[PDB]
């Protein structure tokens, strides 16, 4: 099968580019939007329009192959690729990538996603957007050639042998951490939700005491609102350093709190997502390392889950080789090709590291299509419901796309 | 090319099955939930899960064509099909229908989008929500089979000749009709906010002085956070016979006012839902009409779009051939069958009516794509952004899909 055209549209996402230093400065609150100027090159407002690039491979066959490039929130923070302006970015596209991809005879899914995962226009990277959605699009050419599903392709390609099996979805709150909570009971969830607890004052409290309270009110509401007694998801909080800044990084004193929140949560198990934040990736992966070691040598049922300072494919490996955590967070958008969230996960399976096949909120319903057959071809122990912030719209995207897949794989297996 | 297996999945959509009857006895909120005993059948807890099916017609092949089944939030109210529980109609799917479509012969989309609308179980018709996933998933397989988009296809059986351009996309606030403006702002809607007014005390004021107020809000929210100075959306705000209310469906009350809000709205033209809500479908059609004269004759360059008393395609046509608006809500998910969305808007196109191409928050990415190709297809005059009330998603869903097909059409032109 041969590729025969591709084609670029910008588009829209589930969320919005924010202006991470402008907010970070101050920037004050009129509405939905952020007010005072943008410091970030390439924003006009503090708060735009995330933007997609839809990508299109039309097959020999006829049959069309779809991916999207999409960046997180903070598109062009510190350590990121420039903004990604669908205008800045399809010209690079339509100029550099579709010349070869053009009557190319499709191969198998590695070999050309780390291509163009690695490919260099002028000795320079493509934008790590570029690189999802390309890949996304190959991803799905490769299915749509082999008449298979995507997740069957990546389980081919990076683990052989495996059955797809549905994978818990984990879906997040933001700062309307009780009505969405409601949602999420309603939706399911196996993993939830998230709490945004990102204040050590306002959201954990100063000795814990406000994030102990919303552990009892999750675990009361789940009670209460469960359509079937059998519903008993995994509770995943993000305190985003918090825990780390309100008991000064101490192994125990975390532990020991960590260990009242696990006893609040019962029945229900407790993971906590970046107990600390401190000051390089060698630190980071020391205090996650040994707060797992303190937890796991006093059988405190808690699970550590990784995220600031393990960003690349490289510091994934980094924080499973040194179990700095129970749980890695694969950043699905920031990897660039897809094809390396496939080696992140099969890495940390390797290893026996939990592996969460991550995601944002800024991306779109085909890119989470496209991620969650990859999480589900590599067994990833939970992946994101995405894009967008109505709770809603993620977990039925995601799930639904994982109940068909598990259709056409249980069907193939019956042939 | 014939389908060789129809395999049906349970999932999830953008939002809720609410039970209506239980809400207006007096149901109280409790976070997103409601309290007390449900009233209707089929329910219970007053709001759950809403549910699709997801309809997979695997071909010869090897292609897998997709619909999903979805109904209203309001599933099983007054004069609606049965609570759409997946569990209750898979399988009626698997039993009555997937015998009819296993080594069936793809040929046009239209006598096989009306042989499936149409069909009896036992003497009675299918539940609209079966029809509504069946015949997309039917469109999809002629898509397929012919290498083109729904959208062409549609065009091709319904709109011969016609071009496919983009639709205006219009998307609903729900109650959040402050900061779901700012969102619709910053992501460009077409057309907005819908904005929920139903209620006359609260929401329209009861000499309407509150939605006037809402009006000059809007107006001026627009131009403060507009990027481009250029972009000039259609307000469309529905009412909920709310203005019928306040002014005892005076004809000329009811035009003076409306004449005060065209007036407060200016620069941006406005569309007025449901102005009033009568007794029946004959005093709607006669009430519409009237205000709708009395509007054109005093030049009054504000349109009336119908909803309430006009359901079924009967409706569509009874309404457009007595002029009783200047644009009919196409309900989609109520007609069935897609065709009968095809059907509905050619005719409005034959007779000098806008079409609507509607929807509802509790369906799904897929039926959401499909009819969007299909209100492209026929060149309605505005498309709902969909599903869910996240708007975000909604508005990227249907966007991101409606440039997609633009841009496989565009090429397909020049081939
Ligand atoms: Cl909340
Ligand atoms: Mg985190
Ligand atoms: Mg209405």
Redesign the interface.
Known sequence: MKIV?V??????????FDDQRAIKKGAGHD???YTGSTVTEGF??V????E?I?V?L?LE????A?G?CAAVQYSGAGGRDPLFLAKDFIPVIEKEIAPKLIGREITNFKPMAEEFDKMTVNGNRLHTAIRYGITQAILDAVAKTR?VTMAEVIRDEYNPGAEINAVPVFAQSGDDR??????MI???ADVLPHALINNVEEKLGLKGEKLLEYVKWLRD?IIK?R?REDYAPIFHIDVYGTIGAAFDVDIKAMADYIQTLAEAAKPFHLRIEGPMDVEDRQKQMEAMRDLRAELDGRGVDAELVADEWCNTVEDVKFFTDNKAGHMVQIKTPDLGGVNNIADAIMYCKANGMGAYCGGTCNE???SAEVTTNIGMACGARQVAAK???????????V??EM??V???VG?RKKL
């Open positions: 055209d084609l670029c549209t910008p588009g829209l996402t589930g969320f919005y509405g939905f939007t006009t407002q708060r735009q329009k995330g997609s839809s299109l039309v066959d006829g049959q069309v779809h999207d008449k009780y009505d969405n909570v409601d949602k309603i939706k399911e509401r609102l359509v779109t319903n085909r894009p967008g912030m109505g709770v809603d719209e993620g977990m039925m995207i799930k639904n109940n068909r598990l259709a056409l069907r």
